[PDB]
Amino acid sequence: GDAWAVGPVTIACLGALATLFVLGVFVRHNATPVVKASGRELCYILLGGVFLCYCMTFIFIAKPSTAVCTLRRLGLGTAFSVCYSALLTKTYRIARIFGAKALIVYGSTTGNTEYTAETIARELADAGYEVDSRDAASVEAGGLFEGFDLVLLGCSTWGDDSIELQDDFIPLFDSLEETGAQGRKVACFGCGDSSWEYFCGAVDAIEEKLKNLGAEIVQDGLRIDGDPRAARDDIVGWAHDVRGAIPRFISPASQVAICLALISGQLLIVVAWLVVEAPGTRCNHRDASMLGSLAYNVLLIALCTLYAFKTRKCPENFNEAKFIGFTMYTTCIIWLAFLPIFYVTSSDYRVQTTTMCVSVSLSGSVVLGCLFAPKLYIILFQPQKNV
């Protein structure tokens, strides 16, 4: 009769208990770095989603009613949508910040502008950028700026009659049209001497050509007078203002906005089909009412796995990106394995519903077991690491 529901209900109960435990430990330690650095708000939205996956079991084991059918269609897509929107936004946050790529191309004869470049690069990698420093002799003009979020061009001033660019930088300057400059966020730097009429004339020449090319000049170029080693405060100070180009911060309020929008998209699909195809009684629409709902979640997961794989090497918040990666790879394995299972068990409603319950629970279990279990281990057993 209802013995088929012992297995699913036991799982859902233990899973809801485990989710309330994980929430509790997180809230108890809400101000500690492990809980704050991870993009806190998103982690709460995720546990809510996971708790809902376990709650789905009760709604599927309960007797079909117009309300039960509404909630079955409403909840199944939404519960998963809450999980994967939280996971996508977390990955987007990592990608947007540690994603950003900077390129520094310097021109130096005595290595002063090279030192200034070496200081800026260290500061930017510390800021979160994936810096790529190169000398103007090594660089080839064609497609040199492509795929870089930020580009810094360093060069010294020469000439014994007028402004002259550093020798390695002249071939780059003359063929700057074929570099990818238009629309690119740029900044210039260089070393000169105030004993010369045109102090850092090279910086001026490069800034003006970039303006003409259609580049986004982020800041007034850095002009180092004399020894750059004595201007470290000026050079680091400038690199601090430069780094605030591709934003290195996403507000918790903005994180919940993106997440909430991605949930809203599924809710629009699931409500739109409840309006056209009214719920009723077994449940009236067990056909292709959840097809759109499924496509939306298949998109979210695929997107999330692609971003998670791209962000896998990021060490921030105790290698979180690695564990977000693992939860997504396991989700793909689950989803791709249960798809033929639902097809072959379509003849038996009890087996079909039991499988649905087990798999929805399993999907929720890999989020707890892969993302939260390593976080809970540091919180509860390694407190010295959480301070």
Ligand X SMILES: Cc1cc2nc3c(=O)[nH]c(=O)nc-3n(C[C@H](O)[C@H](O)[C@H](O)COP(=O)(O)O)c2cc1C
Residue numbers of the site for ligand X (CB under 6 A)?
A: 108-113, 156-160, 163, 166, 191-193, 196, 198-201
Handedness of CA 374, 379, 385, 387 (dihedral sign): positive
Q: Residue 194 carries which side chain, given as an amino acid letter?
A: S
113 versus 352: smaller Cβ distance to ligand J9U: 352
Which residue do the tokens 């492509």 mark? 146
329 binds, among ligand X, ligand J9U, none (CB under 5 to 8 A by kind): none
186 versus 366: smaller Cβ distance to ligand J9U: 366
80 versus 158: smaller Cβ distance to ligand X: 158
Q: Where are the alpha helices (DSSP H) in the chain?
A: 6-28, 33-37, 40-61, 66-98, 112-127, 170-174, 201-213, 232-242, 252-276, 291-310, 316-344, 349-367, 373-381
CB of 254 to ligand X, least distance (A): 41
C-alpha span between 340 and 358 (Å, rounded)? 15
CB of 86 to ligand X, least distance (A): 49
49 binds, among ligand J9U, ligand X, none (CB under 5 to 8 A by kind): none
Partnered with residue 26 across adjacent β-strands are none
199 binds, among ligand X, ligand J9U, none (CB under 5 to 8 A by kind): ligand X
Nearest to 358 by CA among 373, 344, 375, 338: 338
C-alpha span between 364 and 385 (Å, rounded)? 27
176 versus 360: smaller Cβ distance to ligand J9U: 360
Residue 184 three-state SS? coil
Residues of the shown chain interacting with ligand J9U in the complex, contacts defined by CB under 6 A: 72, 76-77, 80, 286, 289-290, 293-294, 297, 334-335, 338, 342, 356, 359-360, 363
75 versus 180: smaller Cβ distance to ligand J9U: 75
CB of 303 to ligand J9U, least distance (A): 14
User: What backbone phi and psi angles, to 5 degrees, belong to 317?
Assistant: 50, 50
- Count the Cβ atoms, other than its own, within 10 Å of residue 27: 11
CB of 135 to ligand X, least distance (A): 11
200 binds, among ligand J9U, ligand X, none (CB under 5 to 8 A by kind): ligand X
Partnered with residue 132 across adjacent β-strands are 103
196 binds, among ligand X, ligand J9U, none (CB under 5 to 8 A by kind): ligand X
85 binds, among ligand X, ligand J9U, none (CB under 5 to 8 A by kind): none
- Residue 120 structure tokens: 């800026």
99 binds, among ligand J9U, ligand X, none (CB under 5 to 8 A by kind): none
60 versus 145: smaller Cβ distance to ligand J9U: 60
219 versus 345: smaller Cβ distance to ligand J9U: 345
- Residue 250 structure tokens: 């996403």
Note whether 141 and 105 are within 8 A (CB).
no
